[PDB]
Write a protein that binds this ligand. Sequence first.
Ligand SMILES: [Cl-]
Ligand SMILES: [Cl-]
Lengths: 119, 121, 5, 5
Amino acid sequence: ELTEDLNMELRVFFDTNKSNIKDQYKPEIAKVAEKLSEYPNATARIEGHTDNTGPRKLNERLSLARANSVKSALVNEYNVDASRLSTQGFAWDQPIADNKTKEGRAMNRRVFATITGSR
Amino acid sequence: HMELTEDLNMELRVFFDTNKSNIKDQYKPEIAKVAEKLSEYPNATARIEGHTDNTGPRKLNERLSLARANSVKSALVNEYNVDASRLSTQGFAWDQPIADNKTKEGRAMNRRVFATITGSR
Amino acid sequence: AXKXX
Amino acid sequence: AXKXX
Ligand SMILES: [Cl-]
Ligand SMILES: [Cl-]
């Protein structure tokens, strides 16, 4: 008998007021897809964020759109089954850096996807 | 960017004939797979433990239990070119029964080697 | 609709 | 050297 536990952490960043995925992240996303195909029971927790600039409602929608964009790539570009992926936006409520600098805001405009599962 | 880890956990069970420490071809396929996974997980290591049923001299069984563990290691090292430094062996004689020694079936189950493979990549 | 920064 | 059973 044997078991193999899969743990992944994917990080995607976005430009201001955009939810499109840059080409530089595509390879990472392909890697995630590959692992999801190797671990059928694995699921992904995709969470989107925005920096603290702009309207609250706009950022609520944008953060969700960012997580859904990462899921869309996975499902439509990498054949990953949509039923295995969750998405959610947290607006600016969960910053990983200070919004007072352009580097910090750059860091907050992102999507973190945590993949877990065993086979 | 993205971080990724895979944790391996597996157990191999090998059984032996009375007073015998030879690996019966009945378990070669089982062993072949362990070697393959040890290849897939280069950092993986194995804790090989041998046992005996409760019949016979204590010393004979302490040596037999160890001999059984070393037999499985030798299969991996010699037949599967596995690095010996990745495999540890220990004998427990009859101190860790898993079945009833009063029955023929239980003794057969106690004459064993349990190998636990664990690693990451 | 329209963030800045 | 010599288990039985
Ligand atoms: Cl960045
Ligand atoms: Cl058996």
